[PDB]
């Protein structure tokens, strides 16, 4: 009551006036996450086609975190990130225009099909290039997993859902928020240590697992149990290890590393040679629904 009142208030000291509704027609649910849904909507004016991402303020388990989106958006836009261009209040919902990657999630490619090399090192150096330069301003995604990787027609690939993420600085250095998708997050994170953007690079150690496998380690698994599972084994293998290249292996094992101290960076894995293997964007293409 008070509480939403009091928040919705906040909000909109931080978002742009007005209602997007003035100008957009025909929204179109096309999927939801964990914050809430994702509609297209098409630019009066244009005939262009906008995403609009749809949170409800009273439905979130942490609703601080919605100002993410609003720091992303101001501060951190690039190349291989989902271009956002307004955030408004209308009602009780946050919403936010931004790019439409109409070529869809990297998940219904995962689900359904098998990528080769070069597919998996061109979506590997896309979002290590985003990352690399998230990184190096303090900023952690922390919900890296193939839903959080979205992708053009022409087959760019693009990061998306910085709902989860966080700053570290000088004067933080370190999070300790337990965040992100249980089958994806980092062992030091559910260790509840204190822990770094080196947990990205574990979560997309995890997402290189889809890319082979189709699923994350432990899928079958309650996600409590999954996360015990993955603060007290060895590392997870591929289910079955003759399906990538040794190059693929020995880029796996500096991802999927225990101790984040030993982890590579963003920076480091740039320099992989398995990533000599990226194909361009048109690579990724065929992979599509609508190619498929």
């Known amino acids: 009551?008070?509480?939403?009142?009091?928040?919705?208030?906040?909000?909109?000291?931080?978002?742009?006036?007005?209602?997007?509704?003035?100008?957009?027609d025909?929204?179109?649910?096309?999927?939801?996450?964990?914050?809430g849904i994702v509609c297209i909507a098409t630019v009066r004016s244009s005939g262009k086609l906008v995403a609009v991402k749809k949170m409800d303020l009273r439905?979130?388990?942490?609703?601080?975190?919605?100002?993410?989106?609003?720091?992303?958006?101001?501060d951190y836009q690039h190349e291989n990130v989902v271009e956002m261009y307004n955030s408004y209040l209308v009602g009780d919902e946050l919403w936010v225009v931004m790019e439409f990657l109409e070529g869809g999630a990297l998940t219904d490619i995962v689900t359904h099909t098998r990528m080769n090399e070069e597919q998996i090192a061109a979506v590997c150096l896309a979002?290590?290039?985003?990352?690399?330069?998230?990184?190096?301003?303090?900023?952690?995604?922390r919900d890296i997993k193939s839903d959080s990787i979205l992708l053009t027609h022409d087959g760019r690939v693009k990061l998306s859902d910085f709902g989860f993420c966080a700053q570290?600085?000088?004067?933080?250095?370190?999070?300790?928020?337990?965040?992100?998708?249980?089958?994806?997050?980092?062992?030091?994170?559910?260790?509840?240590?204190?822990?770094?953007?080196?947990?990205?690079?574990?979560?997309?150690?995890?997402?290189?697992?889809?890319?082979?496998?189709?699923?994350?380690?432990?899928?079958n698994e309650p996600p409590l149990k999954a996360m015990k599972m993955i603060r007290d084994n060895l590392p997870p293998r591929l289910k079955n290890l003759h399906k990538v290249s040794p190059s693929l292996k020995g880029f796996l094992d500096r991802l999927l590393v225990r101790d984040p101290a030993q982890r590579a960076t963003a920076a480091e894995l740039l320099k992989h040679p398995f990533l000599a293997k990226a194909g361009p964007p048109a690579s990724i293409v065929p992979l599509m629904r609508q190619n498929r």
């Open 127 to 141: 979002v290590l290039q985003a990352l690399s330069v998230l990184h190096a301003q303090g900023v952690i995604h």
């Open 59 to 74: 439905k979130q388990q942490r609703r601080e975190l919605l100002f993410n989106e609003v720091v992303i958006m101001r």
């Open 26 to 35: 025909n929204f179109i649910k096309i999927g939801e996450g964990s914050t």
């Open 1 to 24: 009551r008070v509480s939403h009142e009091q928040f919705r208030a906040a909000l909109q000291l931080v978002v742009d006036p007005g209602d997007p509704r003035s100008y957009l």
């Open 168 to 219: 570290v600085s000088k004067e933080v250095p370190r999070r300790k928020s337990l965040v992100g998708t249980p089958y994806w997050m980092a062992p030091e994170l559910i260790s509840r240590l204190p822990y770094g953007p080196e947990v990205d690079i574990w979560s997309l150690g995890i997402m290189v697992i889809e890319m082979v496998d189709g699923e994350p380690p432990y899928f």
